[PDB]
Scaffold this active site. Sequence first.
Site, PDB file in Angstrom:
ATOM      1  N   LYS A   4      34.171  76.907 106.884  1.00  0.00           N
ATOM      2  CA  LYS A   4      35.522  76.997 107.480  1.00  0.00           C
ATOM      3  C   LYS A   4      36.792  77.500 106.435  1.00  0.00           C
ATOM      4  O   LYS A   4      36.302  77.464 105.348  1.00  0.00           O
ATOM      5  CB  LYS A   4      35.762  75.589 108.053  1.00  0.00           C
ATOM      6  N   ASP A   6      40.476  80.499 114.802  1.00  0.00           N
ATOM      7  CA  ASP A   6      40.792  79.098 115.032  1.00  0.00           C
ATOM      8  C   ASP A   6      42.121  78.796 115.283  1.00  0.00           C
ATOM      9  O   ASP A   6      42.481  79.772 116.020  1.00  0.00           O
ATOM     10  CB  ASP A   6      40.184  78.207 114.022  1.00  0.00           C
TER      11      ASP A   6
HETATM   12  N1  LIG Z   1      38.439  79.586 118.789  1.00  0.00           N
HETATM   13  C1  LIG Z   1      37.200  79.217 119.033  1.00  0.00           C
HETATM   14  O1  LIG Z   1      36.240  79.966 119.322  1.00  0.00           O
HETATM   15  C2  LIG Z   1      36.789  77.679 118.608  1.00  0.00           C
HETATM   16  C3  LIG Z   1      37.749  76.718 118.568  1.00  0.00           C
HETATM   17  N2  LIG Z   1      37.201  75.507 118.755  1.00  0.00           N
HETATM   18  C4  LIG Z   1      38.227  74.284 118.474  1.00  0.00           C
HETATM   19  O2  LIG Z   1      39.012  74.092 119.530  1.00  0.00           O
HETATM   20  C5  LIG Z   1      40.253  73.792 119.143  1.00  0.00           C
HETATM   21  C6  LIG Z   1      41.427  74.903 119.456  1.00  0.00           C
HETATM   22  O3  LIG Z   1      40.865  75.916 119.478  1.00  0.00           O
HETATM   23  P1  LIG Z   1      41.705  77.250 119.776  1.00  0.00           P
HETATM   24  O4  LIG Z   1      41.679  77.431 121.454  1.00  0.00           O
HETATM   25  O5  LIG Z   1      40.927  78.422 119.379  1.00  0.00           O
HETATM   26  O6  LIG Z   1      43.150  77.218 119.439  1.00  0.00           O
HETATM   27  P2  LIG Z   1      44.401  77.866 119.796  1.00  0.00           P
HETATM   28  O7  LIG Z   1      45.197  78.441 118.766  1.00  0.00           O
HETATM   29  O8  LIG Z   1      44.313  79.043 120.986  1.00  0.00           O
HETATM   30  O9  LIG Z   1      45.388  76.561 120.635  1.00  0.00           O
HETATM   31  C7  LIG Z   1      45.312  75.244 120.470  1.00  0.00           C
HETATM   32  C8  LIG Z   1      45.973  74.609 121.238  1.00  0.00           C
HETATM   33  O10 LIG Z   1      46.127  73.122 120.820  1.00  0.00           O
HETATM   34  C9  LIG Z   1      47.543  72.892 120.526  1.00  0.00           C
HETATM   35  N3  LIG Z   1      47.825  72.220 119.318  1.00  0.00           N
HETATM   36  C10 LIG Z   1      47.218  72.670 118.247  1.00  0.00           C
HETATM   37  N4  LIG Z   1      47.529  71.834 117.201  1.00  0.00           N
HETATM   38  C11 LIG Z   1      48.157  70.925 117.712  1.00  0.00           C
HETATM   39  C12 LIG Z   1      48.715  69.663 117.058  1.00  0.00           C
HETATM   40  N5  LIG Z   1      48.404  69.710 115.700  1.00  0.00           N
HETATM   41  N6  LIG Z   1      49.171  68.690 117.807  1.00  0.00           N
HETATM   42  C13 LIG Z   1      49.151  68.958 119.028  1.00  0.00           C
HETATM   43  N7  LIG Z   1      48.984  69.787 119.710  1.00  0.00           N
HETATM   44  C14 LIG Z   1      48.181  70.760 118.875  1.00  0.00           C
HETATM   45  C15 LIG Z   1      48.215  74.248 120.566  1.00  0.00           C
HETATM   46  O11 LIG Z   1      49.636  74.119 121.217  1.00  0.00           O
HETATM   47  P3  LIG Z   1      50.660  75.129 120.868  1.00  0.00           P
HETATM   48  O12 LIG Z   1      50.206  76.386 121.618  1.00  0.00           O
HETATM   49  O13 LIG Z   1      52.197  74.293 121.316  1.00  0.00           O
HETATM   50  O14 LIG Z   1      50.898  75.352 119.565  1.00  0.00           O
HETATM   51  C16 LIG Z   1      47.434  75.173 121.477  1.00  0.00           C
HETATM   52  O15 LIG Z   1      47.808  74.907 122.925  1.00  0.00           O
HETATM   53  C17 LIG Z   1      40.336  73.439 117.706  1.00  0.00           C
HETATM   54  O16 LIG Z   1      39.853  71.953 117.635  1.00  0.00           O
HETATM   55  C18 LIG Z   1      39.248  74.432 117.339  1.00  0.00           C
HETATM   56  O17 LIG Z   1      38.642  74.036 115.966  1.00  0.00           O
HETATM   57  C19 LIG Z   1      35.951  75.132 118.569  1.00  0.00           C
HETATM   58  C20 LIG Z   1      34.942  76.054 118.930  1.00  0.00           C
HETATM   59  C21 LIG Z   1      35.307  77.391 118.534  1.00  0.00           C
HETATM   60  O1  LIG Z   2      32.505  80.957 114.069  1.00  0.00           O
HETATM   61  C1  LIG Z   2      32.849  80.909 115.044  1.00  0.00           C
HETATM   62  O2  LIG Z   2      32.643  81.544 116.207  1.00  0.00           O
HETATM   63  C2  LIG Z   2      34.242  80.132 115.234  1.00  0.00           C
HETATM   64  C3  LIG Z   2      33.582  78.572 114.609  1.00  0.00           C
HETATM   65  C4  LIG Z   2      34.240  77.471 115.011  1.00  0.00           C
HETATM   66  O3  LIG Z   2      35.499  77.037 114.509  1.00  0.00           O
HETATM   67  C5  LIG Z   2      33.516  76.402 115.694  1.00  0.00           C
HETATM   68  O4  LIG Z   2      32.650  76.576 116.377  1.00  0.00           O
HETATM   69  O5  LIG Z   2      33.840  75.168 116.038  1.00  0.00           O
END
Ligand SMILES: NC(=O)C1=CN([C@@H]2O[C@H](COP(=O)(O)OP(=O)(O)OC[C@H]3O[C@@H](n4cnc5c(N)ncnc54)[C@H](OP(=O)(O)O)[C@@H]3O)[C@@H](O)[C@H]2O)C=CC1
Ligand SMILES: O=C(O)CCC(=O)C(=O)O
Lengths: 456, 452, 455, 448
Positions: free
Chosen positions: B115, B155
């Site tokens: 990460k 992420d």
């Molecule tokens: N992208 C991927 O492929 C993967 C993502 N994940 C997990 O999913 C979660 C988010 O992923 P992702 O969709 O890519 O992120 P995004 O950047 O697309 O959006 C994240 C969302 O969470 C909100 N948010 C973010 N940080 C905070 C915070 N500190 N407090 C309150 N609300 C918050 C944001 O609000 P706002 O828009 O207002 O900032 C936004 O709506 C994370 O835990 C990530 O690790 C897991 C598997 C893979």
């Molecule tokens: O490697 C990826 O596809 C993103 C990895 C990740 O942040 C997760 O799977 O939670």
Amino acid sequence: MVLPHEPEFQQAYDELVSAVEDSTLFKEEPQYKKVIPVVSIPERIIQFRVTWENDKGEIEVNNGFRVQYNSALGPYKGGLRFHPTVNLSILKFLGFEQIFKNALTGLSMGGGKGGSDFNPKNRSDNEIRRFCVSFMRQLARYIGPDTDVPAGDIGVGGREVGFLFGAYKQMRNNWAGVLTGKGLTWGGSLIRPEATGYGCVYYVEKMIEKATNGKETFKGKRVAISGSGNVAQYAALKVIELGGTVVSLSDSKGSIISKNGITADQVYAIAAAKLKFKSLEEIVADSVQLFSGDHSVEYLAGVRPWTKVGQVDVALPSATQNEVSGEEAKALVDAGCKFIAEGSNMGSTKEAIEVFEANRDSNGVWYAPGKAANCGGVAVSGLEMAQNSQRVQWTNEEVDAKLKEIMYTCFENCYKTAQKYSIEKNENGLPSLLKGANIAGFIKVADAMFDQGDVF
Amino acid sequence: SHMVLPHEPEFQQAYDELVSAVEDSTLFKEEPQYKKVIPVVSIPERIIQFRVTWENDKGEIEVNNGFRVQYNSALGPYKGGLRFHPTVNLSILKFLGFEQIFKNALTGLSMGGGKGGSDFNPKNRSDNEIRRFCVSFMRQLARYIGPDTDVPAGDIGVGGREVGFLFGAYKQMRNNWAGVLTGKGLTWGGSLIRPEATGYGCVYYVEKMIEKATNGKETFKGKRVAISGSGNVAQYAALKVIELGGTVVSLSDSKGSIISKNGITADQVYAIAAAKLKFKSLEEIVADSVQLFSGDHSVEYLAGVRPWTKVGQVDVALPSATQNEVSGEEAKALVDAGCKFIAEGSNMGSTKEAIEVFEANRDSNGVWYAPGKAANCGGVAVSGLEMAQNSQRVQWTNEEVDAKLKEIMYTCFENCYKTAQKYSGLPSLLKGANIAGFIKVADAMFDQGDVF
Amino acid sequence: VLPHEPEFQQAYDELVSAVEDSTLFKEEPQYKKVIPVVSIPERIIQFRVTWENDKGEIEVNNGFRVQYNSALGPYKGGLRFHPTVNLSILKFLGFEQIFKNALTGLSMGGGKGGSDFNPKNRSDNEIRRFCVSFMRQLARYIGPDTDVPAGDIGVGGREVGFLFGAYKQMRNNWAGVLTGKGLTWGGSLIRPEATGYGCVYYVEKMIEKATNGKETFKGKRVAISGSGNVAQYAALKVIELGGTVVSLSDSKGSIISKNGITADQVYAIAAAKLKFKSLEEIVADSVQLFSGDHSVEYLAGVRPWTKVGQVDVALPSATQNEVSGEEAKALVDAGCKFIAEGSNMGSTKEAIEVFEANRDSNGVWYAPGKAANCGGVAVSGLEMAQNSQRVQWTNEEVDAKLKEIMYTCFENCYKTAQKYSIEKNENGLPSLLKGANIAGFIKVADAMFDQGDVF
Amino acid sequence: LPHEPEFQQAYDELVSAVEDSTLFKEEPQYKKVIPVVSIPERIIQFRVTWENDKGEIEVNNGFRVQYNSALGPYKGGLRFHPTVNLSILKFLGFEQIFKNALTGLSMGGGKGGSDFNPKNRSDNEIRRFCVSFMRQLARYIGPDTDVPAGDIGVGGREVGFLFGAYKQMRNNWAGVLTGKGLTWGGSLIRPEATGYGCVYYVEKMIEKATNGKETFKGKRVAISGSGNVAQYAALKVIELGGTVVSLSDSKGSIISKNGITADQVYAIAAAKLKFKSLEEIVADSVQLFSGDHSVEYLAGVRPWTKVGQVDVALPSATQNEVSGEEAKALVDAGCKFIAEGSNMGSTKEAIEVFEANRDSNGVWYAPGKAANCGGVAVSGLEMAQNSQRVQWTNEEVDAKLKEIMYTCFENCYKTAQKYSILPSLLKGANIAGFIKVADAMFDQGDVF
Ligand SMILES: NC(=O)C1=CN([C@@H]2O[C@H](COP(=O)(O)OP(=O)(O)OC[C@H]3O[C@@H](n4cnc5c(N)ncnc54)[C@H](OP(=O)(O)O)[C@@H]3O)[C@@H](O)[C@H]2O)C=CC1
Ligand SMILES: O=C(O)CCC(=O)C(=O)O
Ligand SMILES: NC(=O)C1=CN([C@@H]2O[C@H](COP(=O)(O)OP(=O)(O)OC[C@H]3O[C@@H](n4cnc5c(N)ncnc54)[C@H](OP(=O)(O)O)[C@@H]3O)[C@@H](O)[C@H]2O)C=CC1
Ligand SMILES: NC(=O)C1=CN([C@@H]2O[C@H](COP(=O)(O)OP(=O)(O)OC[C@H]3O[C@@H](n4cnc5c(N)ncnc54)[C@H](OP(=O)(O)O)[C@@H]3O)[C@@H](O)[C@H]2O)C=CC1
Ligand SMILES: NC(=O)C1=CN([C@@H]2O[C@H](COP(=O)(O)OP(=O)(O)OC[C@H]3O[C@@H](n4cnc5c(N)ncnc54)[C@H](OP(=O)(O)O)[C@@H]3O)[C@@H](O)[C@H]2O)C=CC1
Ligand SMILES: O=C(O)CCC(=O)C(=O)O
Ligand SMILES: O=C(O)CCC(=O)C(=O)O
Ligand SMILES: O=C(O)CCC(=O)C(=O)O
């Protein structure tokens, strides 16, 4: 909440920053204001698992770090520390120190530091070798004679440097100055063991000369030393050679105090035994005759020597960080101490420095920070790099003379710089060597950083 | 010897969850050798911290901290996303990479754990500042990654735009074109289901959960589903729920929640995605699209509030936003509201207290919790499928990648279930996932001499 | 002051004028930023190539590798050993290659290389020594994920073999650093046929669209220039499809027939050209093959375009600027309705002006080389895929992938030209030139924006 | 071959100097060398993309010509100037091979740069460009491979930005560039090196031509340009008792009769750092350029014809800055010593004039590859200091530079005499460098 708590690093940072702000520097050139938040964030940090095998065939794990802080003036240069307290905070304080120390040596050497929370005490040479091999195998990819040249420190001496050098050569297939403090037959330098302590005593020589217009020397001066390692052993030996009386040494368990001075044979025996991880208690027990005659010494367990030496003229903290408290500083001033110079890195607490500096212009009490006073060690390390790169080895006298000249120049740079950037130049008084060293090092590093585009 | 290690609360939370799942099983008694692995695997193989210096639009110097935690490489090259968010520190990234090891293990692909990220904040920042930062970041990082060494991805704060900038910087520094990153654009080495991957996979996992819990008598048909966040994970989880006949009752962001009673529509998710690309708040999004959020599909915006208590009766909950976004009290509120299925789209979305609540209601109220390391692994799985496509010099169709994602998610559910039962109503998927991933990783570490 | 580079400026002007004469900059004006960036190569490498001839004397030549654009993949391009080679020619070729590769739908950047070394009538030992010297100067800068060269004029299977051996000796790696490799050490099965087969497949789709399936290559007169890999296998595919190949040519003259060149004649031409024989020398050495009902007339020093009478299809397959404006008018007057370049930039600007001016009126359809000859690099990319997978595909599998790639390219040219045309004629043939240039430009430019190469 | 007039000018000069000598008759093997050595070992062209202060994308061409490495790693400066193309850089690197050969140090030949124009540009834009350039270039250089330095448009500031970019990309601190700052690996005489060395070489020229009866004392010396070369050539002429009668730049010349003073040169340097014209500097400091030491500014004209009687001429600006007519004007104005501070400062016509008046009117011409080799010599001394991890004193570097220049003068004289048919210093320098480089190429199997 976001940035982790790193108190030792913050202590070193605060010392330098308050020395720089409390001066005419930002008024004369405000561009330097841009530099503080950049140089303070390390160019690079490398943390790695160090997996090794103890003598019972069980798996042991420790944390290994290399902080490559600043490379403006040269490749990263710094020691390695094997001690159970080691963490990113301690190593950051040490590497931040190292940047401006190296700037003060006048040689082309960047700032860095590394180590591990591995504990080498009471461990077999085989376990030390296995750990050094694993450690250097994890580190080798990130160091090199033009990139990052580590050396020893607490827990890391010639034995450890040798194991590390061998491991590096087996992994990287190169023979070069990848480390300093090497053995004399495989790329070492002659004054590197003595370097740090000899340089501290030379720096205090120049301090005394300036403070007394040449009327006093180390002749007949009572010197309280802490620690009993490389720095302390050789600082004591130089103080003895120059006609002073070394009244104390210490270690992690207690102090030893004498009234007529510690002898050179005593330092030799302490060194030989400390190689074997002996306590000062155990060594005064093992050589009853050597520590009992007219040169007897009293061993005080659990105590630092500063309050236990009575009247004292010079104090050379040479053990670890934050080993002189405000209380111990006031006690030293009351005991007549007029010269305090750190052989150890950040040996004095903020309170100790406050006391010393507040007694400067009134009692002529002169404090010199470690980044100025102990830079002889890295200075002669850089001289080892010079010998390696030139494929020559210099004589004892040659390296000792270069060390002397480097320490004296560092003192003059501290003094003149402190005068140039003093807010109120109190004449008939001593200028702040603390501020002098911090400002000289900062200016050199920051000018180079501007030139190379690291700041704009 | 005391208080040497730095305070890392999020990392310790993930560590404690995994350890307590492994200890409370027959695993350490049946084979005690595994006891040796916990203190080795928990220390990352390698961490790299670096200064990231960049220039803002005024020509001023900006400074940030950059991290890449390469945690475990037993099962493959380090694999993990990059997070650009002002809260980023070594602790958060260590928790994420530690999670990632066993998540990746559950996907059945050859992917190590890692990460990275930075405390750089991209919100309301020009694309120029983002580009300059990504370039500086990747220039500090490239020396330490590679398609066979470490394959970062996106992420929080890092999506297609940032992945593109990072890829460009990498190619300029290292002069090679390869699968050094996943989540790439479709024309330069991306995969077709990678955007949808995480939410789609979470919904597929909850499909299999519901099927097992009801002997095939219930599906997502007619289920009320409360989702948090409105990012990549949440957007596509909501879209899949809609496609499967559920009603999406809520979304959220950093400022508030939006709630509906007829369900959020697909056009609404599309508009939210387009607007979030420009850093708009959900408040600003329901303001800017008055027509789209006011008819029978109206939504109420609750400022400063998470949706868990503000949705009435709810059947499924998919936290898809950030870590520790479900409190013990909010877990009780969901249980009281009839929630029977909870699966994290976000990494460590539930607090320890929430997990305690759900597990305490497992055998009695049939409340079934699935941890993120199982449910959201579709994203990293499709990342690995992108890596495979890159290695093979092919690009697969939508259905091929979607089907591989589906089968990986289903295999993950079956593995969690069987493992939870083997080392012990409904079995605890938490323990199942932790133990299955731990076993695979630890066997590989033993084989390779990382532990003995 | 910029140096004079006429061939590069020619290709540049062709693409630029194709993009400006379209709705493209109106639909997305951001693309205007890309032209002055993409047109400057990412990297060029010049190196002295010292070798030893059979007398033991030292010979010196210039070696080049132009690595133009790597947005869509690692640099991909051939190597040319021909005394006219200079930076200008190779820059035009690599610039071409960017958008050609973009049209193949594969992950391939743009590049091209070679040397002013002249291999004609030279011993295999001298060729081996030169290949070794050249690849040893070049190897440091190429790799299966960085730059994958192949052959071109003067560089064939033998030269690729010597180059692969020298590279493997210098870098100690066995991987797809080159395409056009031997079948037993990482080559692919359709690569020799690839360019000509693909050109004829593209003209297949051209005929189908232009006549609503009412005509095929069946009973068509096809004039081909050149006698190399492109020309040989284009001729063989035309023969297989029932057409009559009325001409070939080389650097010294042309050969013309009226019943069509036979496959055995093409095989003999190939075997003899491997030994650096002229068409004059090959019709002399195999009198039996060129004297019966299949007699052939050799016209020295002349291009075949004016010397074939009525012709339906023209496939220039020799070198750059091999169809002049006058020859274009002669071909139009002779009834030619399909013109597709087997060579890179085979037609001068004047010839293209003629063809395009007769498009909407006489239904004369011109297809640029970057679309028509992309089959060769397509099958090279398939060689890269086979090597990466550690598999080797069957003849039919690769031939089918080539066919689908060529058909996809034609459809993309057609639909892209129509989508962005400011001619806006309901009836009429859309400009395949503009189509290919605009489609390739769009893909490359989007990739450059995504990766921060332009902002 | 593409049209490369400057490269062909340098090539033709060296070749005709070697062919018009007994060298090919005494040992014909040298005939094999010319068509090998004249083709550069390697050329690297690359796009340099950067961003201006408006946040707009700018694109320029970057070149590094690594010409010959027989005697050592490639050594040569970097030039940022809108006229830069492959021809100019090939002419400069071809020159540099044999210049380095004359310095007696282990240095190959090379040269590089860009058509980027640094004039009137903010330090931020310059830093961004240097960063882009060095990041595109670093992969191909190194302290043992190719050690670039400065030239027209590239000085200490630019060397600093470039060094920073290289260290950031390659993670090494070493002598990858010369002309570095004194606090981070520089040498003490490097700024002064080129002009000082030119003046020392002309010292020995005058000494040999008059058997020690004349020096720079009381001589009228006409200098062109007002950059590093010209500034320090002027300062050394002043210190040695000469009278600086002219300077110039890209817009015009300045001429005086009482001599240019040191303070005037210091001000010109400070202002040229900010890209000010000589017109603008004589306007901004009226007191310094109007008092007892007033100066007349002639726009658009080279100073050679506008200084009257003159004894020494030091073209110190750019290539082809002395025409045949200006050469005849200098000869008629009494000039007897001509030494190029710039690389190929004199045209073929000027050199023909000087050589044709050599044996009859005693006018002595010395090519740049001999006279201006002091800069690259002290660059090599900087490299030596870096490799040894030492920094020398001012006096040490000045003495080594002086002795290197004197050795070069003696080599020119002796070699011209050994293979001839006052001796021609042009042929001497060209033949000495050619012999050294060619012997090394034979030894290493580059020619056979
Ligand atoms: N992208 C991927 O492929 C993967 C993502 N994940 C997990 O999913 C979660 C988010 O992923 P992702 O969709 O890519 O992120 P995004 O950047 O697309 O959006 C994240 C969302 O969470 C909100 N948010 C973010 N940080 C905070 C915070 N500190 N407090 C309150 N609300 C918050 C944001 O609000 P706002 O828009 O207002 O900032 C936004 O709506 C994370 O835990 C990530 O690790 C897991 C598997 C893979
Ligand atoms: O490697 C990826 O596809 C993103 C990895 C990740 O942040 C997760 O799977 O939670
Ligand atoms: N070695 C060198 O070349 C350089 C060293 N320094 C600084 O000098 C100081 C000591 O260096 P060095 O002589 O090499 O180290 P050594 O390993 O040789 O010995 C260190 C001394 O400090 C004592 N000490 C160590 N840890 C603690 C602790 N946690 N609390 C109290 N006392 C302690 C040790 O006692 P015990 O033996 O019982 O453990 C020992 O007497 C350090 O701050 C180092 O950074 C500075 C410049 C260079
Ligand atoms: N080979 C490939 O895979 C690809 C080739 N192309 C293009 O197709 C054309 C030829 O390719 P290819 O068949 O492989 O090359 P070859 O080396 O196999 O042969 C080229 C043919 O063109 C003739 N010819 C070559 N140069 C000239 C010239 N300067 N003037 C006049 N006639 C000339 C040659 O005649 P002779 O040898 O008898 O003297 C030879 O018959 C080139 O423009 C190339 O760029 C495009 C795609 C890929
Ligand atoms: N620098 C060194 O160590 C060495 C330099 N040289 C040669 O000396 C010459 C100049 O070097 P340097 O002093 O460092 O360069 P600078 O960039 O510092 O200045 C060059 C001077 O020449 C003027 N000038 C520049 N270009 C032209 C032009 N095209 N036409 C007319 N006048 C011009 C400039 O005027 P303005 O400022 O107005 O633009 C400036 O006064 C070059 O040919 C270089 O190769 C040779 C040996 C070593
Ligand atoms: O020798 C060195 O590298 C530095 C020595 C040291 O440990 C220090 O200065 O703190
Ligand atoms: O196969 C390749 O790499 C390129 C083929 C070729 O000669 C071309 O497309 O110009
Ligand atoms: O001084 C250097 O190192 C580069 C060479 C140079 O600029 C010259 O002598 O013309």
